[PDB]
Design an enzyme around this catalytic site. Structure first.
Site, PDB file in Angstrom:
ATOM      1  N   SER A 197       0.838  -1.167   0.115  1.00  0.00           N
ATOM      2  CA  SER A 197       0.083   0.089  -0.032  1.00  0.00           C
ATOM      3  C   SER A 197       0.980   1.110   0.191  1.00  0.00           C
ATOM      4  O   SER A 197       1.771   1.351  -0.769  1.00  0.00           O
ATOM      5  CB  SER A 197      -0.896   0.023   1.252  1.00  0.00           C
ATOM      6  OG  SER A 197      -1.965   0.972   1.119  1.00  0.00           O
ATOM      7  N   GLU A 324      -9.066  -5.092  -3.706  1.00  0.00           N
ATOM      8  CA  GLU A 324      -8.455  -3.990  -2.901  1.00  0.00           C
ATOM      9  C   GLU A 324      -9.364  -2.922  -2.263  1.00  0.00           C
ATOM     10  O   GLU A 324      -9.129  -2.335  -1.198  1.00  0.00           O
ATOM     11  CB  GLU A 324      -7.183  -3.350  -3.788  1.00  0.00           C
ATOM     12  CG  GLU A 324      -6.534  -4.382  -4.548  1.00  0.00           C
ATOM     13  CD  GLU A 324      -5.096  -4.640  -3.585  1.00  0.00           C
ATOM     14  OE1 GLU A 324      -5.558  -4.220  -2.332  1.00  0.00           O
ATOM     15  OE2 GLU A 324      -4.199  -5.002  -4.294  1.00  0.00           O
ATOM     16  N   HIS A 437      -7.485  -5.635   0.876  1.00  0.00           N
ATOM     17  CA  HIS A 437      -6.183  -4.691   0.981  1.00  0.00           C
ATOM     18  C   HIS A 437      -5.298  -4.939   2.165  1.00  0.00           C
ATOM     19  O   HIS A 437      -5.920  -4.746   3.395  1.00  0.00           O
ATOM     20  CB  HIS A 437      -6.575  -3.338   0.643  1.00  0.00           C
ATOM     21  CG  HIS A 437      -5.648  -2.436   0.399  1.00  0.00           C
ATOM     22  ND1 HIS A 437      -4.696  -2.468  -0.444  1.00  0.00           N
ATOM     23  CD2 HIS A 437      -5.069  -1.277   1.203  1.00  0.00           C
ATOM     24  CE1 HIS A 437      -4.006  -1.633  -0.574  1.00  0.00           C
ATOM     25  NE2 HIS A 437      -4.186  -0.696   0.457  1.00  0.00           N
TER      26      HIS A 437
HETATM   27  O1  LIG Z   1     -10.703   7.947   7.826  1.00  0.00           O
HETATM   28  C1  LIG Z   1     -11.157   8.555   6.674  1.00  0.00           C
HETATM   29  N1  LIG Z   1     -11.147   8.027   5.764  1.00  0.00           N
HETATM   30  C2  LIG Z   1     -10.511   7.017   5.086  1.00  0.00           C
HETATM   31  C3  LIG Z   1      -9.841   6.074   6.020  1.00  0.00           C
HETATM   32  C4  LIG Z   1      -9.085   4.907   5.328  1.00  0.00           C
HETATM   33  C5  LIG Z   1      -8.137   4.043   6.093  1.00  0.00           C
HETATM   34  C6  LIG Z   1      -8.558   3.509   7.469  1.00  0.00           C
HETATM   35  N2  LIG Z   1      -7.546   2.606   7.624  1.00  0.00           N
HETATM   36  C7  LIG Z   1      -7.347   1.815   8.772  1.00  0.00           C
HETATM   37  C8  LIG Z   1      -5.975   1.009   8.497  1.00  0.00           C
HETATM   38  N3  LIG Z   1      -6.153  -0.323   8.576  1.00  0.00           N
HETATM   39  C9  LIG Z   1      -5.902  -1.267   7.537  1.00  0.00           C
HETATM   40  C10 LIG Z   1      -4.834  -1.470   6.696  1.00  0.00           C
HETATM   41  C11 LIG Z   1      -4.765  -2.247   5.665  1.00  0.00           C
HETATM   42  N4  LIG Z   1      -5.870  -2.933   5.431  1.00  0.00           N
HETATM   43  C12 LIG Z   1      -6.679  -2.932   6.393  1.00  0.00           C
HETATM   44  C13 LIG Z   1      -8.126  -3.995   6.044  1.00  0.00           C
HETATM   45  C14 LIG Z   1      -9.198  -3.701   6.884  1.00  0.00           C
HETATM   46  C15 LIG Z   1      -9.106  -2.797   7.922  1.00  0.00           C
HETATM   47  C16 LIG Z   1      -7.990  -2.180   8.285  1.00  0.00           C
HETATM   48  C17 LIG Z   1      -7.115  -1.930   7.307  1.00  0.00           C
HETATM   49  C18 LIG Z   1      -3.855  -2.315   4.847  1.00  0.00           C
HETATM   50  C19 LIG Z   1      -2.893  -1.173   4.711  1.00  0.00           C
HETATM   51  C20 LIG Z   1      -2.354  -0.882   6.128  1.00  0.00           C
HETATM   52  C21 LIG Z   1      -3.605  -0.474   6.859  1.00  0.00           C
HETATM   53  N5  LIG Z   1      -6.932   2.574   6.368  1.00  0.00           N
HETATM   54  N6  LIG Z   1      -7.295   3.415   5.567  1.00  0.00           N
HETATM   55  C22 LIG Z   1      -9.136   4.900   3.997  1.00  0.00           C
HETATM   56  C23 LIG Z   1      -9.935   5.585   3.290  1.00  0.00           C
HETATM   57  N7  LIG Z   1     -10.755   6.710   4.009  1.00  0.00           N
HETATM   58  N8  LIG Z   1     -11.974   9.608   6.909  1.00  0.00           N
HETATM   59  C24 LIG Z   1     -12.371  10.492   7.964  1.00  0.00           C
HETATM   60  C25 LIG Z   1     -11.785   9.968   9.394  1.00  0.00           C
HETATM   61  C26 LIG Z   1     -12.003  11.082  10.411  1.00  0.00           C
HETATM   62  C27 LIG Z   1     -12.886  12.018  10.143  1.00  0.00           C
HETATM   63  C28 LIG Z   1     -13.147  12.564   8.638  1.00  0.00           C
HETATM   64  C29 LIG Z   1     -12.823  11.572   7.754  1.00  0.00           C
HETATM   65  C30 LIG Z   1     -13.342  12.230   6.439  1.00  0.00           C
HETATM   66  C31 LIG Z   1     -12.187  12.275   5.351  1.00  0.00           C
HETATM   67  C32 LIG Z   1     -12.931  13.025   4.278  1.00  0.00           C
HETATM   68  C33 LIG Z   1     -13.218  14.374   4.759  1.00  0.00           C
HETATM   69  C34 LIG Z   1     -14.417  14.339   5.961  1.00  0.00           C
HETATM   70  N9  LIG Z   1     -13.638  13.391   6.915  1.00  0.00           N
HETATM   71  C35 LIG Z   1     -13.924  13.389   8.141  1.00  0.00           C
HETATM   72  O2  LIG Z   1     -13.891  14.498   8.891  1.00  0.00           O
END
Ligand SMILES: O=C(Nc1cc(-c2cn(CCNc3c4c(nc5ccccc35)CCCC4)nn2)ccn1)Nc1cccc2c1[C@@H]1CCCCN1C2=O
Ligand SMILES: O=C(Nc1cc(-c2cn(CCNc3c4c(nc5ccccc35)CCCC4)nn2)ccn1)Nc1cccc2c1[C@@H]1CCCCN1C2=O
Ligand SMILES: *[C@@H]1O[C@H](CO)[C@@H](O[C@@H]2O[C@H](CO)[C@@H](O)[C@H](O)[C@H]2NC(C)=O)[C@H](O)[C@H]1NC(C)=O
Ligand SMILES: *[C@@H]1O[C@H](CO)[C@@H](O)[C@H](O)[C@H]1NC(C)=O
Ligand SMILES: *[C@@H]1O[C@H](CO)[C@@H](O)[C@H](O)[C@H]1NC(C)=O
Ligand SMILES: *[C@@H]1O[C@H](CO)[C@@H](O)[C@H](O)[C@H]1NC(C)=O
Ligand SMILES: *[C@@H]1O[C@H](CO)[C@@H](O)[C@H](O)[C@H]1NC(C)=O
Ligand SMILES: *[C@@H]1O[C@H](CO)[C@@H](O)[C@H](O)[C@H]1NC(C)=O
Ligand SMILES: [Cl-]
Lengths: 530, 530
Positions: A197, A324, A437
């Site tokens: 990623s 993904e 993913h």
């Molecule tokens: O968090 C947000 N969006 C978000 C989070 C993610 C996200 C969350 N995570 C958790 C990390 N865990 C995982 C990982 C991976 N796979 C996973 C698979 C399942 C669950 C978690 C995973 C592989 C790569 C390593 C990390 N990763 N990406 C992806 C796309 N969008 N938005 C958010 C959060 C708080 C406040 C706000 C927002 C939004 C954003 C848009 C504007 C307005 N927003 C907010 O105010």
């Protein structure tokens, strides 16, 4: 002795760790940077000053400061990615697993974690380097790097917060490996960097960046590539987001110096609590503080560098997973749930397309919708759900990677491409999410070899196959061992790739070619023209 | 007596013709307008002045002046469409087939020939009305109308060449039927107009035009609809083409009066020899002189009339053939031949989509290409061939008709939709051309009932089914006889249609809905952007 190593910055004492009825040596939490704290927040990293005495490398280090995911508190599927150590800005450390007895001069693999450039830890259970180090007889290193504003706040023209400093953290850890891994039995001329990623995009960014190219031999990219739409911003957009961060925290905005001085006074979680507020659009798969195309780390635009061949020419191995996009929809798109089949209404489909392609005008949104909608059956909630899943994965991961793979292969010295489509038997996520993913990582790192984790015997065999592909590629530039079925080279003309699953290897051609013509050729032209 | 009929314009004497071991009465070549010759060229038609004596109506009339197709000299597949009588500007005549003995007040069907508004004849062998009139006991009329510049030269604002006069020819023949068909045993309150290609577009144009609506009861449209992209032009484009015609003939262009006067002095063949030169682009399925959207025959745009329900509300039966586009490609696109499988290279494919969508900008051409290209197999000459075939048929016939049928059904009183996909056993054209534009007509007119033409018994049964559907619809507004399988109404919600072929009836829904979303919704929006 075996656990006491003298490096160019001082002595380190590792620990003897059990692995699969045997043991190997672990050196955990070795510092490779001065702590980037206080006045050094947002600055380029500085080499770690030598220490006297023995650095105790028996324990994992702190994790960098980051937004902790609380959507599913206590649920292992999400908690497995959160920091499992104390968070601190004092987080620039690396970890090393060394086979026992120490080999003479063996292949090195350096893991770069993902997490959207806003999160991630070297210390996650699925990144435990001991099974791969032991099973394949490699020296396995995991680095760390600042994330979020701490790593990627970009005020171009300032040397106090220039941007890209998390990439420079990665580079400094590679420099340390280059200078010191010989003392641990590793060959500094045969270093493979690999990551998933944002870590895969990072690997690709070091391939591009002149200042990184001499610090590794070859590369593996998992579910990420440097050209991903979420992986970088312009100098102007980075500056805009930095100024808007200061606005959220009532900072003086009259000068870079005054803005930075203000931001340096804030507690880390104060910055983190407003981090999502600086994004320009409602969106999924978009992150606030990411690499900037600055003219220094990246001398020109990524596309111009790819077109001209201005990048490191070596072997690469790379690939994607079947689904993904699925967890991103869970986290931010209407109608999705971890506890249901998430059948998606027409209305929620349209909302999700907009969140998924936030930069698109209305005609671009219509183009995406037409490409992924079966108009014989448009109220099928399963097709709507799966169509959105494919949109997110194709736009954000698969088609950017296929663009990278086709540009790179014109100049590189060997490409190997895979499609990972095995759903783990013990997966805690629902079936609609498919092959998620990040869920190839546990096979790359050999977790199915641990009987207590209850993978099937075929999943253990798959993991062993993958570990051997990865490490044989790392050693030689070719995942195949001479003399036997062969993983074929990806070529410009035949464009072959393999599936990675529990069935016998099958070779295919032109991965996702139809949708990627849409994402890589037609939609960009449409958005440029309209 | 039975063959002697006094009409409002004078007496006519018909002829007794054999049909299928019986006989019926034929009244061939009855005039319905003044000869539009000399200073009447380009002008609205005038009613035929009454004659004294007995009009000898035992012989087919002249055909209107038109471009004669010589691409395949002596080949029956093309020659069967060419004028089989002498050509003359004195060509405004109609033919009537009447069951014997003469019925009292029976259903009337009036045939309008196609030919792209530039060609066509009422007298073609496949338009012989005697099998349908005898078998279904209907009074069958075939009309004529000026084609090419003679019928559709349009200098809007001039009353000497206003445009649409070929459509007024058709209307005057409908007025003649309204006023006179009672004398032949026909009911003027139960008149069905039916036509194919340009004839089918014409039928839809009389549905829309207020001046035509009261002159028929219900309508059948075969492979043509009024909104087809080739079937009309704007007043500005009609004017440009008229002036360009004058430029090709070294005419004074300073006023409409002088331009028209110059064109009226030319021999008919002089106009025809330069007709194709006024088209704006290299193209297929485009014709120089067609109906104009004039504010008179058509009070507003076709789309605004369809959207508001401004049209005759009645029952319609309509449909398309499987391979509408195939003969158009043979005539004008590279790589196609009547004597080969016409496998199409990628280069010839690209040239073909440009000829097929001549009005599209480069972005629009990319969109068409992406929609019809299998990028896993882009060099497959059979897929390229059939893809181009589908492009021509979808854009020019199927999707315009589907747009019409969906708009009409919102306000109409009953819609029946068919998909004709039978390839005739005795076809003279190669297999790649499939089910060709125009080749349902011979089934509609009952030609498979003639043993000497060597159709199969299954094809005679299919022709008898189709004639009974057509005539039962004409008599009642419903192609089904209440008593037995049933052809269901097309509805806004369920959108049902039937296949017409030698197999038992299949009901389907949403005829070619995926491609027609592209042609009817997305592409027009793409072409209308910046
Ligand atoms: O968090 C947000 N969006 C978000 C989070 C993610 C996200 C969350 N995570 C958790 C990390 N865990 C995982 C990982 C991976 N796979 C996973 C698979 C399942 C669950 C978690 C995973 C592989 C790569 C390593 C990390 N990763 N990406 C992806 C796309 N969008 N938005 C958010 C959060 C708080 C406040 C706000 C927002 C939004 C954003 C848009 C504007 C307005 N927003 C907010 O105010
Ligand atoms: O004729 C041209 N193009 C063309 C002809 C036709 C065409 C030919 N025909 C013959 C009519 N015969 C048939 C009919 C039907 N089906 C047929 C099925 C097979 C064979 C003939 C058929 C059903 C409807 C009734 C008529 N119809 N349409 C269709 C689309 N494009 N182009 C042309 C001709 C001479 C000169 C020029 C051109 C082009 C025009 C474009 C600019 C440059 N060109 C010229 O200079
Ligand atoms: C009307 O025209 C027809 C067609 O020419 C005339 O009929 C033909 O007449 C000849 C001899 O006069 C016969 O051998 C043919 O068999 C006839 N053909 C048909 C189709 O009838 C007819 O005599 C004319 N009637 C007039 C002029 O009053
Ligand atoms: C290093 O730290 C670990 C745990 O903090 C401890 O068990 C070990 O004895 C330490 N070694 C030293 C201080 O030499
Ligand atoms: C890699 O480079 C070597 C030496 O230049 C060349 O012989 C070999 O064919 C190359 N392999 C690929 C896959 O490009
Ligand atoms: C793994 O399998 C063992 C053996 O049945 C079982 O006791 C244990 O609960 C399983 N663990 C998980 C996490 O499923
Ligand atoms: C046709 O119109 C009549 C008269 O209003 C109505 O009763 C009938 O339901 C209509 N049929 C269809 C198919 O619309
Ligand atoms: C019909 O078939 C017979 C014998 O098969 C043949 O002699 C005759 O010429 C055919 N007719 C046509 C019009 O092809
Ligand atoms: Cl076909």
């Amino acid at each position: 002795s075996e656990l006491l190593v003298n490096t160019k910055s001082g002595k380190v004492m590792g620990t003897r760790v059990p692995v699969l009825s045997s043991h190997i040596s672990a050196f955990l939490g070795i510092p490779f940077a001065e702590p980037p704290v206080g006045n050094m927040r947002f600055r380029r990293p500085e080499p770690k000053k030598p220490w006297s005495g023995v650095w105790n490398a028996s324990t994992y280090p702190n994790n960098c400061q980051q937004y902790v995911d609380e959507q599913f508190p206590g649920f292992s599927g999400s908690e497995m990615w959160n920091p499992n150590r104390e968070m601190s800005e004092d987080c620039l450390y690396l970890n090393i697993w060394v086979p026992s007895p120490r080999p003479k001069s063996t292949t090195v693999m350096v893991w770069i974690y993902g997490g959207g450039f806003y999160s991630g830890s070297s210390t996650l259970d699925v990144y435990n380097g001991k099974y791969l180090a032991y099973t394949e007889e490699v020296v396995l290193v995991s680095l760390s790097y600042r994330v979020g504003a701490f790593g990627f706040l970009a005020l171009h023209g300032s040397q106090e917060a220039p941007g890209n400093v998390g990439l420079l953290d990665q580079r400094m850890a590679l420099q340390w490996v280059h200078d010191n891994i010989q003392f641990f039995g590793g060959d500094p001329k045969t270093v493979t960097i690999f990551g998933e990623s944002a870590g895969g995009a990072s690997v690709g960014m070091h391939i591009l960046s002149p200042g990184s190219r001499d610090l590794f031999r070859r590369a593996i990219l998992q579910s990420g590539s440097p050209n991903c739409p979420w992986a970088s911003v312009s100098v102007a957009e980075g500056r805009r987001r930095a100024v808007e961060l200061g606005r959220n925290l009532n900072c003086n905005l009259n000068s870079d110096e005054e803005l930075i001085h203000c931001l340096r006074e804030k507690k880390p979680q104060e910055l983190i609590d407003v981090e999502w507020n600086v994004l320009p659009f409602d969106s999924i798969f978009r992150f606030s503080f990411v690499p900037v195309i600055d003219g220094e780390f990246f001398p020109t635009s990524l596309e111009s560098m790819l077109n001209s061949g201005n990048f490191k020419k070596t072997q690469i191995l790379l690939g994607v997973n079947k689904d993904e996009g699925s967890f991103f929809l869970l986290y931010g798109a209407p109608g999705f749930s971890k506890d249901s089949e998430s059948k998606i209404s027409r209305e929620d489909f349209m909302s999700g397309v907009k969140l998924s392609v936030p930069h698109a005008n209305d005609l671009g949104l219509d183009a995406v919708t037409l490409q992924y909608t079966d108009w014989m059956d448009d109220n099928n909630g399963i097709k709507n759900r799966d169509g959105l899943d494919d949109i997110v994965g194709d736009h954000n991961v698969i088609c950017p990677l296929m663009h990278f793979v086709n540009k790179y292969t014109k100049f590189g010295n060997g490409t190997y491409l895979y499609f990972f489509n095995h759903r783990a038997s013990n997966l805690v996520w629902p079936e609609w999410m498919g092959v998620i993913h990040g869920y190839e990582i546990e096979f790359v790192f050999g977790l199915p070899l641990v009987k207590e984790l209850n993978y099937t015997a075929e999943e253990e065999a798959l993991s062993r196959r993958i570990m051997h592909y990865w490490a044989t590629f790392a050693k030689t530039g070719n995942p195949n061992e001479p003399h036997s079925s062969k993983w074929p080279l990806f070529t410009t003309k035949e464009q072959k790739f393999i599936d990675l699953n529990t069935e016998p290897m099958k070779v295919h051609q032109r991965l996702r070619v139809q949708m990627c013509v849409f994402w890589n050729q037609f939609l960009p032209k449409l958005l440029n023209a309209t």
